[PDB]
Amino acid sequence: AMGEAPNQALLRILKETEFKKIKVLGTVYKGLWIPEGEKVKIPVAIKESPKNKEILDEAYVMASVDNPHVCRLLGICLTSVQLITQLMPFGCLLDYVREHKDNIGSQYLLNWCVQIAKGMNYLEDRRLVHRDLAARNVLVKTPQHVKITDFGLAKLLGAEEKEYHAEKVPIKWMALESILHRIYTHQSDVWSYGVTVWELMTFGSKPYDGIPASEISSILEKGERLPQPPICTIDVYMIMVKCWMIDADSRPKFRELIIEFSKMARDPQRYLVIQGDMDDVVDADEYLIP
Ligand code: NA
Numbered sequence: 001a002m003g004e005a006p007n008q009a010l011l012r013i014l015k016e017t018e019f020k021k022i023k024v025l026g027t028v029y030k031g032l033w034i035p036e037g038e039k040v041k042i043p044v045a046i047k048e049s050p051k052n053k054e055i056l057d058e059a060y061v062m063a064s065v066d067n068p069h070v071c072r073l074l075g076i077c078l079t080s081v082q083l084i085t086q087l088m089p090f091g092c093l094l095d096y097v098r099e100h101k102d103n104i105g106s107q108y109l110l111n112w113c114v115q116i117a118k119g120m121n122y123l124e125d126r127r128l129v130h131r132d133l134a135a136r137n138v139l140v141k142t143p144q145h146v147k148i149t150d151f152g153l154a155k156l157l158g159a160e161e162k163e164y165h166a167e168k169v170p171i172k173w174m175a176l177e178s179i180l181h182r183i184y185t186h187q188s189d190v191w192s193y194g195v196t197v198w199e200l201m202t203f204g205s206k207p208y209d210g211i212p213a214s215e216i217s218s219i220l221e222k223g224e225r226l227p228q229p230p231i232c233t234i235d236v237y238m239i240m241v242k243c244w245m246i247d248a249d250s251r252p253k254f255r256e257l258i259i260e261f262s263k264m265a266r267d268p269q270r271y272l273v274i275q276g277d278m279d280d281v282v283d284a285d286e287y288l289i290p
Pocket residue numbers: 269272273274277
């Protein structure tokens with residue numbers, strides 16, 4: 001019998017003249033946003049067919065979330081459409097672990113696990129199922145601060161609604177119930193979290209490398225899972241494995257994963273065994289909008 005409360009988030013519409021594109025990043029540009037008369041320059045990423053409707057669905061979700069471990073939308077620009085978000089200078093975490101694989105220690109790894117779980121727990125409190133959690137969809141602000149991104153598949157659940165039933169989706173990150181029945185829940189995001197942790201702990205290897213996506217569900221039905229990464233103690237691997245239980249309500253909760261990884265991060269070498277272990281510039285996190 002729980003009802004729904006209003007979503008009073010504010011969608012900010014930016015003027016094209018207020019931002020300057022500097023260089024291409026991927027099209028996504030790195031640039032500066034300079035709102036008129038405010039004496040600030042904010043580093044931004046500027047991401048530039050009627051299916052426009054997907055970028056607006058994405059804008060709607062990003063305007064509705066506010067957490068230090070979820071990506072920050074500054075606004076949209078309605079030219080012939082641009083989505084303006086906080087610049088995350090070190091890019092996506094998958095590429096970051098692959099490129100710095102010889103300089104990544106146990107403290108960094110465990111702290112990233114904590115932060116992603118905090119962001120995901122926040123999304124669960126907002127009743128949002130992300131549906132595309134992966135290392136590619138975590139962005140790096142600094143080595144010590146990461147945030148979840150890419151809300152293009154995300155869905156808001158009603159207050160009395162446990163499942164989203166879908167009508168292209170990344171098979172190797174998906175829970176088995178999502179592959180077989182198009183059912184998505186916060187517990188299916190937990191399966192994807194487990195896969196995401198596996199990508200980090202292997203320094204960015206591809207899951208189920210060389211196995212085609214059509215084979216994956218039958219592999220999982222037979223009881224097989226991703227293998228224990230060389231650096232992982234049984235304590236860390238057991239958490240991943242629990243994320244990949246068939247029974248979705250047997251999987252850990254994001255709030256539990258925060259607790260378990262924060263304990264490990266207090267004694268990181270017990271849990272991972274690793275070889276060799278401008279004046280007016282304001283970051284978006286210090287530019288608060290009513
Ligand atoms: Na060690």
